[PDB]
Design an enzyme around this catalytic site. Sequence first.
Site, short mmCIF file in Angstrom:
data_model
loop_
_atom_site.label_atom_id
_atom_site.label_comp_id
_atom_site.label_asym_id
_atom_site.label_seq_id
_atom_site.Cartn_x
_atom_site.Cartn_y
_atom_site.Cartn_z
N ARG A 270 2.56 14.17 32.18
CA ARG A 270 3.66 14.19 31.79
C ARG A 270 3.97 15.57 31.23
O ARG A 270 5.12 15.67 30.59
CB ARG A 270 3.88 13.11 30.45
CG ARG A 270 2.85 11.95 30.96
CD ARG A 270 3.72 10.71 30.04
NE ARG A 270 3.46 10.77 28.66
CZ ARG A 270 2.32 10.53 27.90
NH1 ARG A 270 1.56 9.78 28.60
NH2 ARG A 270 2.51 10.68 26.61
N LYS B 76 0.74 -1.21 -0.11
CA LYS B 76 -0.05 0.08 0.00
C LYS B 76 0.88 1.26 0.03
O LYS B 76 0.34 2.22 -0.68
CB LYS B 76 -0.93 0.07 1.25
CG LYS B 76 -2.00 -1.20 1.29
CD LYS B 76 -2.82 -1.07 2.43
CE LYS B 76 -4.15 -1.82 2.22
NZ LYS B 76 -4.02 -3.25 1.95
#
Length: 325
Positions: free
Chosen positions: A175, A64
């Site tokens: 984070r 692909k």
Amino acid sequence: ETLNGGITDMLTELANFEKNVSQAIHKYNAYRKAASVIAKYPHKIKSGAEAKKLPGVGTKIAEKIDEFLATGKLRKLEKIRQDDTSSSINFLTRVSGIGPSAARKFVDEGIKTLEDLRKNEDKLNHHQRIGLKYFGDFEKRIPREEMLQMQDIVLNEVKKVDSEYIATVCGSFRRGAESSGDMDVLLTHPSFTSESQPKLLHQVVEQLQKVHFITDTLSKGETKFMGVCQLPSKNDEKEYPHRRIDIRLIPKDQYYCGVLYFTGSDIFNKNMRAHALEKGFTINEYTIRPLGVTGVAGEPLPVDSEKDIFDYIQWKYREPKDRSE
DNA sequence: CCGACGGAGGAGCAGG
DNA sequence: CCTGCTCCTC
DNA sequence: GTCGG
Ligand code: NA
Ligand code: NA
């Protein structure tokens, strides 16, 4: 833009099709895993054979990529996009509460748009109506400075109910991310352990609805609340978008294993419990347990903070800001 | 080849 | 009342 | 759809 974004967009769109239309969850994660590793790849892929080297890209995705690089599109994708049924099923799953199963049933009985959903309230459940009502807002990102206030209201309103609650806003936010998809709150109380106040989560929810922070409820039980919240309007400016918020009540003896797991990232989680295995330990979202002469996990080890988990496996403690992998 | 791929709380249902 | 199923979520 | 055993 992104070096390989045309390719990662193709894969992500293929992942949504397999998830929403095909109901092939593992193909969805296969395309997602390939899209992730390619977004990290610091070169611009010139052939499918080049991408096939990476872990997660195999024969079918390489072919692909060869086609997308040669013609600038994917015919499998072209035929899927003009198929009216597949894409309506795809679209309806963007409503919170509508998964692939409900999406196909709706499209089967002639329901293809948001307008169709609004004309057919009788056929929606409570969650789906709230997801429809807030369709636009729930697809909006939350800037970090809006998380900070939300966090401040949550911990302040929590402390007023009881100084003994502990609440931690986890996810990418912890984070240090610039934006967040939703708000995920981990709650615990010393009176709730595993070897064990019966309305601990309800009282915290009640208080947040009372100061009109929590506006709606998607699901709610003794240990997990999933609902809707909104910041108060400054009174000088326009009102804020409604946002999604989850609140989980966790036993205190499993709290920091939970805080660690729901802080992430998913790559760091993968790597951290990898290392743990080489050292004779197993970590899930609840406990850290020793192995185990033949490989049997023992009794959970006592954990009073995140660092205890790092110390057991002899890893230097890492800040949440440094836990992206 | 061939099986694994994260997995559980809650909503909404069936049915004992 | 209960368990157990799919569905959805993250 | 991909990987590891
Ligand atoms: Na590969
Ligand atoms: Na949905």
